[PDB]
Nucleic acid binder design. Structure first.
Ligand SMILES: [Mg+2]
Ligand SMILES: [Mg+2]
Ligand SMILES: [Mg+2]
Lengths: 141, 295, 180, 155, 87, 226, 89, 50, 49, 34, 75, 51, 55, 143, 101
RNA sequence: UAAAUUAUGGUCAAUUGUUAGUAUUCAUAUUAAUUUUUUUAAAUGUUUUAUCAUUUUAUAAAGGUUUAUUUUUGAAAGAUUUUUUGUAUAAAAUUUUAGGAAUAGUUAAUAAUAAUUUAUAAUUUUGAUUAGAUUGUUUUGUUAAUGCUAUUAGAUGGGUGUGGAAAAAUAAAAAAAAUAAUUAAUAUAUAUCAAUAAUAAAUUAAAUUAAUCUAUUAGUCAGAAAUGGAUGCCAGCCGUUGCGGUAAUUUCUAUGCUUUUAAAUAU
C-alpha cells in the first residue's frame, strides 16, 4: 500500500500461509499457484514435509494437504529467502555445500529450495550434486 | 515508542550467511570494482607484499626472533609462520593436496571461452592499419622475416580478423624474404579460420607455390576455391558494381535479436564477393599453368 | 632538462625511457634484507610501483643450509645455498624484443644462474687486463678462419628462423592424392 | 568465508592480471606505463573481472547478474511488450513471448552464420602447424626415446 | 557509554592544564560531604578554555600544571574530569 | 604477521613464511569536531556542517557501486563503458542538438538491490529529425562542443503526434505549468489596481524591513529604558 | 663518468673549468686498449640478445598457434551450441 | 601455480618448471625432486585408513 | 661575496593529526599579502615612518 | 557506528542513512523528500 | 544571494525576500511550482484575497483565480 | 605531545618542608588550615592567610 | 576571452599533407569548414551515380 | 495532456509513462514513414542523418520561424564574406591584423592539455577560488 | 607608500622617467618605508621641463580576518604562509569562510 | 507433479563479557590502537664538454578539489642505410554536510567571425550554485557473517611559452656518455620515520663472534584475599550497585593475605 511497506512476493505469502496453517493445525491450505510455488510444494512433498499437493488447473491457487506427527507438526519452520521482490539473492555452490557440511558431518536434514537458470525448481541437495547455483527461494525443515 | 524494534527470536545463521552472497567482499573477490589507484605498495617498500605471493622456503640464516638458526621450528611454523584463517584459528594449508585433482586433467587452453570484443569502426581501422604496417616491417634494420608471422599471430590472438589485405601483405613479405614455409603456414591459418580467399589472395598463394615448386598445394587451392572462377564474357558487365549493403540493424532486429547475432566484427567472407569484383581470373590461370610447368 | 637538477639522483637522456633491470630493496636490518629483480624505466618516482614494466622475482642474499634436501654426504651438495627466484620468459622478452638494459648486480646474478656471461664488473685482480696487437690478430685470423658459407648458415640459425622444415616434414605435409 | 579470504594481497583470492591483457590486447600496459602523468594519483583503469561476468559478451542465458528482474529485465520486458511477472515461467522474467516475437522468425535475420562454425562439424580443419616442442624444447624430457636417440648412451 | 561527557578532552585522554582556582563542592545527596574541585585553565588552538575537575591528586608539593583524565562517573553533579595520580 | 596476536609478535620486519603484509592503519582514532560557528549562524545558506562528515567517493557507507548490468548493456555490446545509451529526447531548443534523458544503475550491496539514476545528455543531430518524445539511441563520438559528445544513431520511435502538431504549427509539446521555484518563500499573486500599487509596494517594503529586523535577534524581555 | 687525467692540458682560463677535455696521445692509445675490452663483452652480449629474441619469437609462434587452434575449436563449439539453441527457440 | 604441481613436476611436459643448481665448482645441474618441491607451499600428507 | 652562510632552517615542523610534520613554507615574494602586512594597521594614528 | 559521525545519538546516524535507502530514493513517486 | 549577503548565516538574509508577480505580465517562468517547502499553488486561490479586497483588480481576479465563487455571492 | 611526567621531575626541586608535611606536623587546636593552592594557616579574626 | 581558448570548431588537422612537413617544413593555411559543411546545410542531395558511358 | 511539472519533465519521466504502460515502441513505423533512412549503419558507424543523405532522403521536422532564420543567416555567411573581402579589404585586413596579434597576446597560445580542456572550470576546480576569478561557478552545463 | 608606488608605476608606464625620478627623490627625502633607501642622482641636469600591469587590489576588510589570524598564530615568523591544520584539527572548521577568497 | 547409487567427491561458516521487576543494541569484558615505565637526525660538492658558452640530468611535502585530473613517441630504448606506418587532448558510472534555493564572460549554431552575429539558450528540488569537511574506485580493525570502522603519497593560473613531455627552484638509498668501486650490505648531529621496538619474566648455561641491559604485580564490600587501631555521613573511596551516623569485611594505617603473571589509568 505504501513505499515503506515491504514488496510481498507469492513465495513469501505462500510460506507464511503454510506456516500459519501448520501453527493452527489445519489439513488443507489454499496457496497461490506459480511455477516456483508449485516446484517448492513438489520438493516438500518429495522430502515428506508435506502430506501432498495438487495443482488444480486454476489460474490463482492450488491445494496442499499438510502432515502432522506425534501431535506436533512435521514442519518445524519455513522462511522465505527474500522478503522483497526488489532484492534477489544468488546461491553459490560453495555456499550450498556449507549447508551440507555440518562441523565435519554430512547433513541433509534442513531443506533449501533453489531455482536455476533452466527454470527447474530443485533442492540444494541436487544443486550440489550437479554443481549448479540458482537463486534461493525458502528454507524449510 | 522511543525504543527500537527487537526480534522475537534469532535469525537463522544459515539464512544470514546465505543472504551474504553478494557482499562487498565477494564483489571484490570477483573483481567487479575496477582499479584506478595504486593499491598496496608492490616493490621497494616496508609493506611491499609482492615477493610473498610466490612460494619460498623458510628463512633460517640467523635469529629471526625465535633463534631460527639452531631451533627445530615445526611447532613455530604450525603456530606462527603459516597463515591462519583469523587470529587464533587453525593454520591455513595452501598445499597442493588442498586443490582438486581435477585441476590436472584439463587440456591446454580449454579453460578460455569465446570472447566477443567489438570496437568502434575508427578503432578497427586504426588497429588494422597498425597491424598491416607491423607485418610489412616492425623495425628499421632488425626486422626478421619471422616477425611478420609473429605479428599476424598476435593479431589473431587479439580477436581480430586478418583481412585479405593483411594476408596479402604477410604472404608477399615472406615470399620476398624467401621463407616460403611461412607463407604456406599463413595460407594454412587462412584455411583453418575459414577465410574464403579473394582472387588476389589466390594469386599471391599461387606465386608462393610457383617459387616453392610444389604443385600439390596449387592442386588443393584450385579444387577448393578456383572452381567457380569464370572469364569475362562479351555480354557481361566488366566493372561489376558494389553489391553488399553495409551492415545495419532495424528497430526489431536491435531490440529482440540476441547480442551474439547483433555483434558484427569485420569478416572477410562478407566482402570476398566485392573483392572478386574485377574478374582477374586470367592471372590465376597463368599462375596455375606455370605451377603445372614447374611440377 | 630541469631548471634545478635533482643533484642527488641524476640520470641520462631524461624520462621516461630505456627500461633497465635493477634490484630494489628497502634498507632494513641486514638479517631481514631481500632484494627484488625487476625491470623498470631509467627514472623512478618516490614509489617504485609507478614505473614497473614487469616483475622478475625475489632474491635472498643470505647463504642458507639445504634443510629441504636430506642430509647427504656430498660435500658440494652440503655447501650453503643462496636462493634466487627469477623469471625466464619475461626476462628474454624484455632483453631481446624490447632491448632493455641491466645493472651490474642483476648481471652477476644472471651470470651465476647461467643466463648471461659474467659481467664486466666482476674481475680477478690476479689476472691483469690484456692488450692487443693488429699484426698478431691478423696472424691468428689467417691461421684459422671459418668458411663464409658455414658462418652465414650459423648466423642465420642463431639470429633468423632456426626451426626449419626438412624434406620428410614437407613430404608429410604435402597434399594427398584425392585432391591432386 | 572467513577473514583470511578478505586479504586481496594473496594471489589465490585475487583476479589474475592477464584478464586485462585479454580484454585490451596483448602487451597493452607497456604503453600505459610510459604515460607521464600516471599514478598521481590515478593510473589507467584495469578491467580485471572474471570472463564469465563480462557484460559485453554474456547475457541472461549464462550470467546471474543479467537475470535481475525489477531493473535488469523488467524495463526490457516493458519496452519489448513481453507479458512479465515476478514469478515468471522464463528465467528472465517474461511469462510469454511478445506478439512480434511469436509472429516473426529471427533465425536468418541480423547476420549470416559465420563460416568458422564448420570447425565443429569438419575434422579436416583441425591443424597444429608446428610440433609440440618445435621451439627447442625437444630435450625437455630426459627419458623420452627421442631425447635418448638424439643424445646416445655415452651422453 | 556516554561520549558527550568528555567534551573538553577533545579526543586525547590526557589534557595538559594549568591551575588557577581550587574550591570545594558538595556531592549529590545522600552522599554528604565536601570534595575538592579544581578550576583549571588550558589553551588549545589559540583558544583558552576553563573547566572544573575532581582534585583526586593528593597534595605533597605546590603544583601549577596538571593532567586531566576522563575517569569514571562521579556523584558530583556536573564535573566529569579527574586529576592524574601523583607519581 | 596480521594473524598473530600482539604478544605473539617476536619481530616486525618481513613475513617469515607468507601471506599479506599490510599496514595497520589505525581506524580507532577518535576524530573530534570543533564547533566554530553559532547555532543559527553557519556560513552556508543551505547545508550545515555540524559534525565530522564522511569523506569518499566509493568508500562511503552504505556502499554504492556502478552497475554495468542494465538494459543498455543487455541490448548493446558496448565497446567502452557507457558508449551507447537509449533514452527519450526531452528539450529541443538548441539548433542541431537533442537533449536525451538516459538512466544508469547503481547497486547497494548492503541492501542487495539496485536503483536507476537519470542523467541528461546533449546529442548532436543533423537535418533536425529529433522531435520531443522520440525514443532515440545515442552513442559516444568526438567532442563537438563544450557539452556535446553524444550523437543520435537511430530514431527507434518517431513522435507522430509531435510531428503532426509541428506540421499544424503548434509546439511539439505544451509547456508544463509547474516549474522550478524561483525562491523558497511562496510567490503571492499581485492583483492590486493602479491606485493601490503604491500601497501594496509600501506593505511589501514594510515586510522586507521586518525580515531585515529579524537579523537583530530575539527581542529582549525588558523594553529598552534609558 | 669520464676520467680526466692530472697530466692533461690545463685550461688557462679563470672564467671556466680548470681542465680541458683533450688528452695525451698515450692516453688516447691506452683508452683504445681499454675500449677494445668493452667491445669483447658487448659483442657476446649483443649476440646473446639476438638469439634470445629469436627464441622468444619462436616460442611465441608455437604457443600462439596452439592457443589459436584451441580457441577456434572452442568458439566453433560455442557457435554450434548457439545455433542449436536458436532452432529450439 | 601450486594447483598444477603434478603437471609442473611431470617430466613429460615441455612447459615444466625449470631449476638450476650452480655448485661451488662452477658447474650447473638439475635440481633434485626435494629441491623442486621446496619451491611450493608445504603440505601435510596423512591417511588414517590403516 | 658573503655566500658562506648555510641553508636556513627557519621553517619549523609542527606536529599534526597523525604526527605528520607540517612545514611552514615561507611565502613567495610575488604576492600582495606581504605588501599589505608591511603597511601600518591604522594609517590615521600609526606612524608612517 | 562511530560516535562522531552525525549527531551524538545513534538515531541521527540512522536518519542520515535512511536518506540513501534504495527503496526511498528520489523519483517521480517520491520526490522532494527533504 | 550574491546581491544580499556574502555567504549566509546572518538571519533574515538566507531566503530571498517576498516576490510579487503580475500574472498578466509575468516576470518569472512557470509561476506555479511544486516543492516540499515552496508550495505556492494554494496561495493563488480565492480566500487569500479577502484581506486586500479594498485595493485589488476584480477583473484580474476573475481572469486568474481558483475556486472562485458565483458572481452573486462575490458581489 | 602532552607532557605528563613534568610533575614527577619537579617533585625533586621542592627542597624544604612541604605544605603537607608541615600541615601534618602541626598539632595545635588553635591553628586552623585551609587549601587553595597549598595548605595555608587561617587567622580567625581576619578570615584570611595568617601572614 | 569570449569563450574557450581553443574552440572545438578550430581543432582541425589535415591528413592530405605529408606527416612531417606541417610541423617544420611549412604551415598549411586554409578555411577547412567550407568543405565539411554538411549536405543538409548546403542543400546537396546524393543523386544516383551515372556510369561514364551513359554520362 | 500537458506535462505536470518542468522538474519531472526535464528528466524524461513524462514520456516514461509510455514505456511503463507497455506501449513503449508500437507505431508501425513503415506506414507512417520510410524506415530505411531512420536507422544507422553499424559497419561504418555513420548516423541516421548520414544514412538519409546517402540514400537521398530527408527526415526534417516542421520548423518554426526562428530556426529557419538561423539557418538562412548561417548559410548567407560565405556568400557575404566572399564579396565583402573583395569589395572592402580595408576593414577585413584591419580585423585580420587584430586577430593575428590577438593570437600572440593571449592565454595559453600553446595547445597543451590545459588549454585543450573543453570545460576548463569543471576540470580545474581547485584553482577556481584562489588562482582564477574569471569563473564563479565550477560547472555551467549538464556535464 | 601605496600612492607613491601607484604613481611611480603610472609614470613608468606613461614613459616619464623624469617625473619618476622626481618622485623617487621626494620619497627618499621624506623617508617612506618602501623608498627609504631608494635614492638616485639627477641625470636630467641640463634640460628644463616641457593588459600591461598584472596585479589585484582589494580593500583591507576582504582579508582582515586572514591578517588577524596570521598574526595571532605566527607573529614571530611573518613569512610563514598560515595554512590549514595550523589553527584547526582535521574534520573541523577553520573558522574563516573563504580562505584566500 | 519421482524418488536414486555404480554412495562423505568440487578441500573446515560459526558466536564464551556474574547480570539484578519489565521496555529499549548504551557502566565493568576480548581483540586492534593510543597512553606511563625516557627506543626511534630527511647528509654536506651531481657530472661531462668545443670556455665568459654549448651538450645529459621531468612530479616531496606550499596553495582545499564531491557532475573534478584527462593526452604524444618528435629525446631515449633503437639495431646496414635511406625511407616508411601509426597517433592524442574526448568519455561513462560511483561523490560528503541534521534542520536545503537559486546559479552564471554564461548554452547551442556558425568560424580558424562575433569586447558589437543568430536563437523561445544553459545549470538545479532526481538536491544545483557558493560555504564547511576531506588529497577519489586493489590497502585496515572487528565479526560466524549481508555490516560497521580505516588507508596513502603526489597535477593549485598565465605572463618570449625551452623541451618529445612543465612535473622546472633544498630535501638519495636513482651509478648518471672510460671497469672509479663489488671483502659490499656499518648507517655520528638537528627535525623525524617504523631498520622505528616487540625477544625462553626467574633453577642445570649459551656447538659464538660474548657483543646491548631494570619498572611499584595490582588488590583485599558485592566477587581470589582482612584482622587491630584511628576517623564517626567528617576526612575520603568509587568500573558498578554505593560506602563513611562511635563492631566501617568499601576511608586512612600497622600487619597479614590474594593473584590464570609481567602492570596501572584514560580516551
Ligand atoms: Mg568524541
Ligand atoms: Mg571546497
Ligand atoms: Mg554504617
Amino acid at each position: 500500500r505504501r513505499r515503506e511497506e515491504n514488496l510481498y512476493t507469492p513465495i513469501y505469502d505462500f510460506c507464511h500461509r503454510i506456516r500459519e496453517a501448520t501453527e493452527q493445525r489445519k489439513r488443507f491450505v489454499v496457496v497461490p499457484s506459480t511455477i516456483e510455488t508449485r516446484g517448492c510444494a513438489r520438493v516438500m512433498h518429495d522430502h515428506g514435509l508435506v502430506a501432498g499437493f495438487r495443482d488444480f488447473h486454476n489460474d490463482r491457487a492450488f491445494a496442499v494437504e499438510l502432515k502432522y506427527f506425534q501431535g506436533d507438526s512435521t514442519i518445524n519452520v519455513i522462511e522465505p529467502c527474500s522478503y522483497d521482490g526488489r532484492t534477489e539473492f544468488e546461491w553459490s555452490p560453495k555456499m550450498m555445500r556449507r549447508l551440507l557440511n555440518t562441523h565435519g558431518i554430512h547433513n541433509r536434514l534442513v531443506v533449501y529450495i533453489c531455482r536455476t537458470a533452466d527454470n527447474r525448481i530443485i533442492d540444494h541437495i541436487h544443486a550440489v550434486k550437479e554443481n549448479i547455483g540458482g537463486r534461493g527461494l525458502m528454507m524449510v525443515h | 515508542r522511543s525504543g527500537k524494534a527487537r526480534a522475537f527470536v534469532f535469525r537463522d545463521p544459515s539464512l544470514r550467511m546465505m543472504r551474504a552472497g553478494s557482499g562487498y567482499q565477494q564483489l571484490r573477490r570477483m573483481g567487479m570494482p575496477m582499479q584506478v589507484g595504486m593499491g598496496w605498495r608492490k616493490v621497494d617498500s616496508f609493506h611491499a607484499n609482492t615477493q610473498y605471493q610466490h612460494a619460498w622456503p623458510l628463512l633460517s640464516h640467523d635469529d629471526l626472533g625465535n633463534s631460527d638458526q639452531s631451533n627445530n621450528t615445526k611447532n613455530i611454523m604450525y603456530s606462527m609462520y603459516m597463515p591462519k584463517r583469523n587470529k587464533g584459528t587453525a593454520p591455513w594449508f595452501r598445499g597442493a593436496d588442498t586443490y582438486s585433482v581435477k585441476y590436472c586433467e584439463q587440456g591446454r587452453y580449454e579453460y578460455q571461452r569465446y570472447l566477443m570484443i567489438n570496437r568502434f569502426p575508427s578503432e578497427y581501422k586504426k588497429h588494422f592499419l597498425s597491424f598491416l604496417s607491423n607485418i610489412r616491417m616492425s623495425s628499421g634494420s632488425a626486422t626478421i622475416p619471422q616477425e611478420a608471422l609473429h605479428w599476424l599471430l598476435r593479431m589473431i590472438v587479439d580477436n581480430f580478423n586478418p583481412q585479405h589485405v593483411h594476408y596479402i601483405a604477410a604472404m608477399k613479405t615472406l615470399q620476398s624474404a624467401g621463407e616460403l614455409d611461412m607463407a604456406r603456414d599463413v595460407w594454412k591459418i587462412m584455411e583453418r579460420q575459414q577465410t574464403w580467399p579473394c582472387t588476389a589472395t589466390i594469386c599471391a598463394y599461387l606465386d608462393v607455390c610457383v617459387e616453392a615448386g610444389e604443385k600439390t598445394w596449387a592442386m588443393e587451392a584450385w579444387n577448393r576455391y578456383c572452381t567457380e572462377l569464370k572469364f569475362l564474357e562479351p555480354g557481361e558487365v566488366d566493372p561489376k558494381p558494389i553489391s553488399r549493403v553495409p551492415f545495419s540493424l532495424t528497430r526489431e532486429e536491435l531490440l529482440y535479436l540476441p547480442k551474439w547475432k547483433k555483434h558484427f566484427d569485420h569478416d572477410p567472407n562478407l566482402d570476398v564477393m566485392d573483392l572478386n569484383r574485377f574478374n582477374r581470373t586470367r592471372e590465376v590461370y597463368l599462375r596455375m599453368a606455370q605451377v603445372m610447368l614447374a611440377g | 632538462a630541469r631548471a634545478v637538477i635533482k643533484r642527488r639522483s641524476p640520470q641520462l637522456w631524461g624520462a621516461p625511457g630505456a627500461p633497465i633491470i635493477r634490484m630494489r630493496g628497502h634498507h632494513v636490518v641486514w638479517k631481514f634484507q631481500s632484494y627484488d629483480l625487476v625491470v623498470e624505466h631509467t627514472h623512478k618516482r618516490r614509489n617504485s610501483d609507478i614505473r614497473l614494466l614487469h616483475y622478475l622475482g625475489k632474491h635472498c642474499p643470505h647463504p642458507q643450509k639445504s634443510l629441504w634436501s636430506p642430509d647427504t654426504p656430498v660435500a658440494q651438495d652440503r655447501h650453503l645455498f643462496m636462493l634466487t627466484t627469477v623469471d625466464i620468459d619475461a626476462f628474454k622478452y624484455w632483453f631481446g624484443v624490447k632491448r632493455c638494459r641491466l645493472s651490474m648486480k642483476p648481471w652477476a646474478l644472471l651470470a651465476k644462474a647461467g643466463l648471461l656471461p659474467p659481467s664486466l664488473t666482476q674481475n680477478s685482480k690476479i689476472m691483469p687486463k690484456p692488450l692487443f696487437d693488429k699484426e698478431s690478430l691478423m696472424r691468428y685470423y689467417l691461421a684459422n678462419r671459418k668458411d663464409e658459407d658455414v658462418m652465414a648458415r650459423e648466423k642465420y640459425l642463431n639470429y633468423e628462423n632456426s626451426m626449419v622444415k626438412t624434406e620428410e616434414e614437407r613430404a608429410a605435409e604435402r597434399p594427398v592424392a584425392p585432391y591432386l | 568465508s572467513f577473514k583470511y579470504a578478505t586479504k586481496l594481497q594473496h594471489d589465490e583470492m585475487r583476479q589474475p592480471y592477464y584478464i586485462h591483457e585479454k580484454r585490451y590486447g596483448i602487451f597493452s600496459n607497456e604503453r600505459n606505463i610510459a604515460k607521464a602523468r600516471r599514478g598521481l594519483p590515478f593510473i589507467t583503469p584495469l578491467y580485471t573481472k572474471h570472463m564469465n561476468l563480462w557484460d559485453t559478451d554474456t547475457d541472461a542465458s549464462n550470467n546471474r547478474f543479467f537475470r535481475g528482474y525489477y531493473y535488469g529485465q523488467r524495463e526490457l520486458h516493458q519496452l519489448l511488450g513481453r507479458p512479465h511477472s515476478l514469478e515468471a515461467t522464463n528465467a528472465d522474467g517474461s511469462n510469454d513471448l511478445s506478439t512480434y516475437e511469436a509472429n516473426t522468425s529471427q533465425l536468418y535475420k541480423g547476420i549470416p552464420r559465420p563460416a568458422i562454425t564448420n570447425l565443429h562439424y569438419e575434422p579436416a580443419w583441425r591443424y597444429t602447424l608446428y610440433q609440440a616442442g618445435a621451439h627447442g624444447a625437444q630435450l625437455s624430457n630426459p627419458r623420452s626415446p627421442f631425447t635418448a636417440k638424439v643424445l646416445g648412451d655415452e651422453l | 557509554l556516554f561520549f558527550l561527557r568528555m567534551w573538553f578532552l577533545y579526543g586525547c585522554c590526557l589534557r595538559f592544564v594549568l591551575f588557577v582556582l581550587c574550591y570545594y563542592m558538595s556531592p549529590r545527596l545522600p552522599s554528604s560531604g565536601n570534595r575538592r574541585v579544581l578550576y583549571a585553565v588550558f589553551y588549545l588552538y589559540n583558544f583558552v578554555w576553563m573547566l572544573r575537575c575532581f582534585f583526586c591528586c593528593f597534595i605533597g608539593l605546590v603544583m601549577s600544571l596538571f593532567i586531566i583524565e576522563g575517569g569514571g562517573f562521579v556523584d558530583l553533579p556536573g564535573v566529569k574530569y579527574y586529576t592524574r595520580i601523583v607519581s | 604477521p596480521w594473524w598473530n596476536f600482539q604478544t605473539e609478535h617476536r619481530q616486525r620486519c618481513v613475513l617469515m613464511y607468507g601471506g599479506a603484509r599490510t599496514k595497520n592503519t589505525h581506524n580507532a582514532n577518535h576524530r573530534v569536531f570543533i564547533k566554530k560557528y553559532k547555532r543559527n549562524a553557519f556560513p552556508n545558506r543551505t547545508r550545515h556542517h555540524w559534525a565530522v562528515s564522511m569523506t569518499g567517493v566509493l568508500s562511503q557507507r552504505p556502499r554504492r557501486m556502478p552497475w554495468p548490468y542494465d538494459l543498455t548493456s543487455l541490448i548493446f555490446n558496448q565497446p567502452r563503458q557507457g558508449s551507447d545509451k537509449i533514452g527519450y529526447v526531452v528539450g529541443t531548443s538548441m539548433l542541431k542538438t537533442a537533449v536525451v534523458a538516459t538512466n544508469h544503475m547503481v547497486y547497494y550491496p548492503k541492501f542487495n538491490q539496485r536503483v536507476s539514476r537519470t542523467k541528461r545528455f546533449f546529442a548532436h543531430d543533423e537535418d533536425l529529425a529529433c522531435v520531443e518524445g522520440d525514443l532515440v539511441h545515442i552513442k559516444q563520438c568526438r567532442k563537438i562542443s563544450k557539452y556535446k559528445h553524444y550523437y543520435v544513431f537511430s530514431i527507434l520511435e518517431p513522435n507522430v503526434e509531435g510531428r503532426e502538431r509541428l506540421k499544424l504549427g503548434l509546439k511539439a509539446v505544451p509547456p508544463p505549468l509547474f516549474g522550478y521555484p524561483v525562491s523558497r518563500r511562496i510567490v503571492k499573486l499581485n492583483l492590486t489596481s493602479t491606485e493601490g500599487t503604491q500601497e501594496k509596494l509600501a506593505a511589501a517594503i514594510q515586510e522586507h524591513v521586518q525580515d531585515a529586523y529579524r537579523f537583530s535577534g530575539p527581542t529582549p524581555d525588558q523594553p529598552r529604558n534609558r | 663518468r669520464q676520467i680526466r687525467p692530472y697530466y692533461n692540458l690545463p685550461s688557462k682560463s679563470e672564467h671556466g673549468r680548470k681542465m680541458t677535455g683533450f688528452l695525451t696521445p698515450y692516453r688516447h692509445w691506452m683508452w683504445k686498449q681499454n675500449e677494445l675490452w668493452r667491445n669483447v663483452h658487448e659483442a657476446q652480449f649483443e649476440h646473446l640478445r639476438r638469439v634470445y629474441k629469436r627464441q622468444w619469437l619462436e616460442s611465441f609462434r608455437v604457443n600462439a598457434d596452439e592457443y589459436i587452434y584451441k580457441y577456434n575449436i572452442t568458439k566453433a563449439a560455442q557457435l554450434a551450441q548457439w545455433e542449436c539453441e536458436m532452432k529450439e527457440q | 601455480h601450486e594447483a598444477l604441481k603434478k603437471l609442473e613436476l611431470d617430466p613429460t611436459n615441455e612447459k615444466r618448471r625449470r631449476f638450476v643448481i650452480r655448485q661451488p665448482d662452477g658447474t650447473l645441474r638439475s635440481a633434485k625432486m626435494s629441491e623442486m618441491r621446496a619451491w611450493y607451499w608445504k603440505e601435510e600428507w596423512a591417511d588414517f585408513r590403516f | 661575496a658573503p655566500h658562506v652562510l648555510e641553508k636556513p632552517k627557519r621553517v619549523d615542523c609542527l606536529r599534526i593529526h597523525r604526527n605528520r610534520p607540517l612545514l611552514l613554507h615561507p611565502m613567495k615574494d610575488n604576492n600582495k599579502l606581504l605588501e599589505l602586512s608591511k603597511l601600518p594597521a591604522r594609517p590615521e594614528f600609526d606612524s608612517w615612518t | 557506528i562511530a560516535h562522531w559521525y552525525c549527531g551524538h545519538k545513534f538515531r541521527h546516524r540512522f536518519m542520515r542513512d535512511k536518506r540513501f535507502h534504495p527503496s526511498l530514493q528520489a523519483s517521480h513517486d517520491a520526490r522532494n523528500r527533504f | 544571494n550574491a546581491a544580499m549577503g556574502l555567504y549566509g548565516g546572518e538571519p533574515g538574509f538566507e531566503k530571498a525576500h517576498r516576490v510579487w508577480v503580475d500574472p498578466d505580465r509575468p516576470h518569472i517562468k512557470h509561476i506555479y511550482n511544486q516543492t516540499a517547502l515552496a508550495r505556492n499553488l494554494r496561495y493563488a486561490r480565492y480566500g487569500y484575497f479577502k484581506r486586500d479586497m479594498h485595493l485589488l483588480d476584480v477583473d484580474k481576479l476573475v481572469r486568474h483565480a481558483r475556486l472562485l465563487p458565483t458572481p452573486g455571492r462575490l458581489l | 605531545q602532552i607532557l605528563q611526567k613534568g610533575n614527577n621531575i619537579l617533585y625533586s626541586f621542592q627542597w624544604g618542608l612541604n605544605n603537607g608535611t608541615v600541615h601534618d606536623l602541626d598539632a595545635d587546636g588553635g591553628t586552623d588550615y585551609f587549601m587553595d593552592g597549598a595548605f595555608h594557616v587561617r587567622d580567625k579574626e581576619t578570615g584570611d592567610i595568617d601572614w | 576571452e569570449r569563450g574557450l581558448y581553443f574552440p572545438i570548431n578550430h581543432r582541425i588537422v589535415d591528413h592530405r599533407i605529408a606527416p612531417g612537413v606541417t610541423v617544420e617544413e611549412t604551415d598549411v593555411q586554409s578555411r577547412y569548414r567550407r568543405e565539411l559543411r554538411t549536405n543538409f546545410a548546403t542543400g546537396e542531395t546524393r543523386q544516383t551515380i551515372a556510369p561514364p558511358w551513359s554520362a | 495532456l500537458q506535462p505536470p511539472n518542468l522538474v519531472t519533465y526535464r528528466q524524461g519521466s513524462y514520456w516514461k509513462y509510455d514505456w511503463n504502460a507497455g506501449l513503449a515502441i508500437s507505431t508501425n513505423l513503415a506506414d507512417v514513414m520510410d524506415p530505411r533512412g531512420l536507422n544507422g549503419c553499424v559497419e561504418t558507424g555513420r548516423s541516421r542523418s548520414e544514412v538519409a543523405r546517402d540514400l537521398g532522403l530527408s527526415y526534417t521536422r516542421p520548423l518554426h520561424e526562428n530556426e529557419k532564420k538561423q539557418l538562412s543567416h548561417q548559410a548567407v555567411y560565405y556568400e557575404r564574406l566572399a564579396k565583402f573581402k573583395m569589395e572592402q579589404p580595408e576593414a577585413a585586413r584591419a580585423m585580420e591584423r587584430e586577430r593575428f596579434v590577438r593570437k600572440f597576446s593571449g592565454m595559453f597560445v600553446k595547445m597543451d592539455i590545459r588549454s585543450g580542456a573543453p570545460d576548463f572550470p569543471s576540470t580545474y576546480r581547485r584553482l577556481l577560488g584562489t588562482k582564477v576569478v574569471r569563473w564563479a561557478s565550477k560547472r555551467h552545463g549538464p556535464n | 607608500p601605496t600612492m607613491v608606488k601607484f604613481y611611480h608605476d603610472c609614470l613608468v608606464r606613461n614613459n616619464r622617467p623624469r617625473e619618476a625620478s622626481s618622485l623617487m627623490r621626494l620619497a627618499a627625502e621624506r623617508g617612506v618605508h618602501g623608498y627609504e633607501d631608494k635614492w638616485e642622482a639627477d641625470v636630467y641636469k641640463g634640460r628644463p621641463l616641457d593588459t600591461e600591469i598584472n596585479s589585484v587590489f582589494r580593500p583591507r576588510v576582504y582579508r582582515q580576518l586572514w591578517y588577524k589570524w596570521q598574526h595571532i598564530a605566527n607573529r614571530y615568523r611573518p613569512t610563514a604562509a598560515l595554512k590549514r591544520r595550523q589553527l584547526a584539527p582535521r574534520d573541523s572548521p577553520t573558522g574563516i569562510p573563504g580562505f584566500y577568497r
